Paper text:
Here we report protein crystal structures of a piscine betanodavirus, the Grouper nervous necrosis virus (GNNV), in four different forms. The overall topological structure of the GNNV CP consists of the N-terminal arm (N-arm) (residues 34−51), the shell domain (S-domain) (residues 52−213), the linker region (residues 214−220) and the protrusion domain (P-domain) (residues 221−338). The S-domain comprises an eight-stranded anti-parallel β-sandwich with three short α-helices, which is a canonical structural feature similar to other virus CPs. The P-domain folds into an independent structure, including eight anti-parallel β-strands and a short α-helix connected with loops of various lengths.
In the delta-P-domain mutant, sixty copies of the S-domain assemble with interactions of I2, I3 and I5 symmetries into a T = 1 SVP with a diameter ~190 Å. Only residues 52−214 of each subunit are observed at a resolution of 3.1 Å. As expected, the delta-P-domain mutant comprises a canonical eight-stranded anti-parallel β-sandwich with three short α-helices similar to the S-domain of T = 3 GNNV-LP. Although the organization of the equivalent subunits around the I3 axes of the T = 1 delta-P-domain mutant is notably similar to the arrangement of the iASU subunits of the T = 3 GNNV-LP, the organization of the trimeric subunits is flatter than that of the T = 3 GNNV-LP. In the T = 1 delta-P-domain mutant, there is no Ca2+ observed at corresponding calcium-binding sites as seen in the S-domain of T = 3 GNNV-LP. The hollow or empty binding site exhibits an expanded geometry with maximum movement of ~2.6 Å of the main chains. We find that, without the Ca2+-mediated interactions at the subunit interfaces, the weaker contacts cause changes in the inter-subunit organization, with expanded assembly of the T = 1 delta-P-domain mutant, similar to the structure in the Asp mutants of T = 1 SeMV. However, the bent conformation of the subunit dimer leads to the disordered N-arm lying at the inner cavity of the T = 1 delta-P-domain mutant without β-annulus formation. The T = 1 delta-P-domain mutant without Ca2+ incorporated shows that the region containing the residues that potentially coordinate Ca2+ exhibits an expanded geometry, decreasing subunit contacts along the two-, three- and five-fold axes, and a flatter dimeric contact of curvature ~155°, compared with T = 3 GNNV-LP.
Author numbering:
A (entry chain O), B (entry chain N), C (entry chain H), D (entry chain M), E (entry chain I), F (entry chain G), ...: 52 to 214
The structure:
Amino acid sequence: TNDVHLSGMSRISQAVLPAGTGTDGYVVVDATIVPDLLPRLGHAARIFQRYAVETLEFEIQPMCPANTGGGYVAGFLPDPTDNDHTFDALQATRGAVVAKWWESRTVRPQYTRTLLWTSSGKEQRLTSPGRLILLCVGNNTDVVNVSVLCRWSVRLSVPSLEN
Amino acid sequence: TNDVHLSGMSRISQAVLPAGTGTDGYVVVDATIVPDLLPRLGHAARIFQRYAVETLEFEIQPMCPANTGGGYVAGFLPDPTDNDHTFDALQATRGAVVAKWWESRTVRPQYTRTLLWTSSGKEQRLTSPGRLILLCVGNNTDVVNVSVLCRWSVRLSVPSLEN
Amino acid sequence: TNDVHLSGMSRISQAVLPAGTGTDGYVVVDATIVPDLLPRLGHAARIFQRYAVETLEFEIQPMCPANTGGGYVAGFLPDPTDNDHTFDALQATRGAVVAKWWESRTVRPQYTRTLLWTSSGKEQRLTSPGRLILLCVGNNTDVVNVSVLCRWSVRLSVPSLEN
Amino acid sequence: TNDVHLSGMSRISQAVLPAGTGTDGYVVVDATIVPDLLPRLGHAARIFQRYAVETLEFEIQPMCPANTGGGYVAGFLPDPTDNDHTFDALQATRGAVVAKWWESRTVRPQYTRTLLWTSSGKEQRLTSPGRLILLCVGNNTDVVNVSVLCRWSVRLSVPSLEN
Amino acid sequence: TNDVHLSGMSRISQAVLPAGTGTDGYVVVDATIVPDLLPRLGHAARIFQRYAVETLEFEIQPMCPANTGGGYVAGFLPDPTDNDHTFDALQATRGAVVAKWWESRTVRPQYTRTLLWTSSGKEQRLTSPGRLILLCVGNNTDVVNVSVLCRWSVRLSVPSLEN
Amino acid sequence: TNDVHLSGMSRISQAVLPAGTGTDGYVVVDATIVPDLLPRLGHAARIFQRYAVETLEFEIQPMCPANTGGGYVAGFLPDPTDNDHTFDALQATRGAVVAKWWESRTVRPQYTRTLLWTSSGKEQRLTSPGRLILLCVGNNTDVVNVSVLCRWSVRLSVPSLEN
Amino acid sequence: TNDVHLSGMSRISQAVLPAGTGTDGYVVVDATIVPDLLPRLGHAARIFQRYAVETLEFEIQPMCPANTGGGYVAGFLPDPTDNDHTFDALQATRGAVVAKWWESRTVRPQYTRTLLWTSSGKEQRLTSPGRLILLCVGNNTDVVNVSVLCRWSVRLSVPSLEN
Amino acid sequence: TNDVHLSGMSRISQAVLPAGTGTDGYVVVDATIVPDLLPRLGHAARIFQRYAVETLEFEIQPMCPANTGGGYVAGFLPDPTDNDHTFDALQATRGAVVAKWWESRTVRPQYTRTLLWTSSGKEQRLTSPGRLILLCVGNNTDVVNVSVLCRWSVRLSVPSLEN
Amino acid sequence: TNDVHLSGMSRISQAVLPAGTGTDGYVVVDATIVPDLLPRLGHAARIFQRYAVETLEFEIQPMCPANTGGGYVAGFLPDPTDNDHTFDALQATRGAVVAKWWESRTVRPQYTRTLLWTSSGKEQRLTSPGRLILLCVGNNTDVVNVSVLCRWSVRLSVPSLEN
């Protein structure tokens, strides 16, 4: 077939949350998923022109001591468009997970599952499959170095070359 | 299957055309079809993120005496975008019906049949499957209290909670 | 195959018979059927050279109050050339219908079925499948605003680009 | 089927390159592909809302004499949005061909194959499948009268009338 | 069977186009296809009375030096009737070809495919299957001796003898 | 079958040829075959719009003494439009017969087999299948009262009423 | 197949034999069978180059009163070459018929059955299949207007064009 | 089988057409085909008595610069006996090709397929299968050195020895 | 099998025929095909004792402007021995090609097909399977740089070490 399947896993973001600064609803990560954000896919984005997302998961990897009065809710909402960053809105999505900050966790969302576009558009419903949000629950006793990782499997289409 | 199917019939609009105000080409109704317009699906759209239209039929239901020398043409054009509210243009669509103001009628269009978006978009041929237009033909002798109803059936897709 | 199939319904004419101006044998419509009379086929006849008539009906759709003392005969004579415009003459064609002015009605004729030509010619039995006539019967008590509609289904032949 | 299949071949543009005006990367033709450009599709686009491309080709037909020091690269890139008009951006596409100016040549691109819309819109990745670019390689000895032909096959879908 | 199949290939016309006299749109050949024009068929035309065209092709055979800044478009429009001799109108037909004057080329049109008449009629839609047009593109540097050839396959019917 | 099959045998003409007034080539009969010529069919022609011939035969019936130096040729040529009235022209038809004036003889032509119209038209190859010609051979020694009879089997197709 | 089958029936000759001028052995017709002599075949003779005779018959059609003391012998000898025009030599051939001058008659000969040539040769055994002779038997009382007719079926070969 | 098959390809002729001497209808080659003319068949002809052509093609091989405004029409007429050396006559034969003088070309005719004789006789349609003709179309600007080659496949039949 | 198969394509010769020196007969190449002329095979011959030629072809590859009045004949005689270097003699062999000097061409002969010998012979009918000849036809107008290439495939025989 003409379609090219790429897979990888990349750090979407890394936030450092100081000793006492989290509270119910504080947005610690808000990452809109674009090929530029996943470095290996960022390169293959310049070779093809449309990409379609075949599997997406986000691994929340917070790094703090086991004595942290932590808490987060992590979710992937499928519109890059909207800013509805509240707990209930995250928990309404499929992947949604909640955990104490000393607990790793994986969000397995359900998404567009459709053909997209490797470069910006007038209508951005076809340039990004969604965005990953990470919210505080309660308030952290200790310093947290959260890094979220996106594992991705993508099928790429129409050859091209954007310089 | 994940896709949730949902059906109903809703009053899209209700106009009161006064007692002589018609003439050929007068727009009494011009409703752009979106989840908020159909109050049951209104709520199903706050839950889910996308939706595809499985059936659409519009039931023109004017209410006036049998002694009304009226005339309407009713038609569903599938560009939620296109201002083109003229007899010929409406009659070119599929479901298009024409009738005296004391005759009920149903339009059965053909349409997008595609997958849309419960939330408003920057590009709006992904938000609405089109619009329903009721046009005067000749002039009414009498008052008409027109109510268009939409019978609909719809498959809603990715879970969410878009306030 | 090569052939294109188009289908639509279109207003062929509109007349506004006022107060008391019809009368046993008065001609309110006399429409020689060509692609130009059907807006959609007007455009698709510029593109193709020839066309064959696969279905043809006419839907008389007059508009008056139910207290109107009218009546019409309507029929399709299958000679674009035939000038005979009397009651018996119409009542000898197949679908021929007669009805009070407050009834809609459908004439379903039988016709050429042959392959014609989208463009004017020296012999016009190759340009038109016939002509739709609408006569008055009795003498209307009131103001009729009548529109006749042609429901067509046609197949187009050999490419071209007529100005 | 409710889908019509149409097929033609239309001149996309005509450029006349005078006796020494071309040069590595000089842009001679750059044409965003839309129904209006291809005469017969323009007339049928005025009749259906939607269209989808089944076959796309571009025949480059330069007219000049055999003693010309020519050269060209023809490519079709499939965003009507993209400006990258450099040799290596064209060669990166599937159809890309190069030739001396006294050599006709067909480009066989790979393209959208998706369902578009026959009128302009806010996002034009839905109105057009791409653009044909024609660039000079080297400078011409002589006068070139280049005409690019686009052969096409299209399937049109939802009835309408854009007067 | 009673039907008689004849085939051949004949010179429809021969134009001599002097050193500098062609320009965009100049009609160099305009030949209405009649049995008299194909000499072998011209004879068999006097034996039968109706002829029907089973295969038609035109071979454009321009004769000039390879250093000619030439260009032509050749097309077969299926009405002997109309004088629409513009490039776009020719290219709209099926056979349509364009080429530099030092390139042979074959137009393979689509035509009436119907029964015709071996002698003149009041309505000439049935005496000739169309006409072959040859137009200049750009302007010729040199003298061109174009000869167009029609290859034909015809089935002849009803015996007869016209003296 | 909606179609009506109708058959008769009627007198096309009657010519009385005095004692010496025939001569190689003299046209005694030249009849163009149309409904009205055939009595029964002339009435059935008023009821329907088209007819297609299904069998035709012309029975030549000269009455005169056995001592007559006569001679005729009779044939059916299939245009109503051909004035070729010469022996060789007649003989080259299929039906063609030659006989002495005291022999009954039957022309069995091959002919149109196509669908005509029951009404005169602008092109007359859609109204009559041909014409029966009768010419003298030698000269007649005696009075000859020739009568020709068309035998016909015809289908009639499209209901109507010509008054 | 490449072979073309033609059939017809033509007047080979017409002799007028005055009141008393025939006698045993008088040659009234002596016709060498060439394509030029059969008018329809005369035309097709210029299109092909070799013709082969598939069926031959001659219908003797003498026209005189029933009171004629007539008599003829008619025969087809298969060499165009030889002048042996005696009764016995005619009766030796296969078709040979004898009859009173007031009797029609048909000679059904046997012939070369071989490939021939549509135009003259140094050896004429291949340009004509034979010749038809008509001789007087006894002597005619009255004037006879004999016309002999050749019915022929021929298959034609190798395309060509003789002007 | 007592038949010896022989193949070859030989030069029938070579002509040098100087600077400006060609013109429509100028005969530059008129070669009647006999075994003496094909060198190897010449020798095999002396050994046998009868030969029959099984394949027969002519390769026209003109040599001149690409900058030549020439033109030729070549064909093979199948009688050695016919002098018709006009264009129309050549184009009517099967092989007949036309071409500018800087284009090579092959005539695949249709021909005798009969059994001929290796030696001269009174009738010469038994000794040659026909003759190759080459005609000018337009005037050559330049010097052409034209060689026509004949590829042949012949079957030789009755042994002898003609010293 | 014990056999070792070896293939290549080698430049047998490079001549350079100056701008007016060529004429019908002039020998430009005359290369006798020995293992040493084919360099790759040159080395394989020192390893084995004998070799049998399995596929042989010669590609004539003259370079010159397209405005050259040239002409050649190329052919492979399968006689290393024979000094017959004349047009007819070359045309008698199988591959033999003729062509203008600005046309590439491929001779494909039929040859010895036998087992020869990689070291010189006292009978040289077992060391080289023939020789490739190139002649002039007419005279060249421009300098010609001809290079002939021998495409070869070979099977080599019996192990050895011949200095």
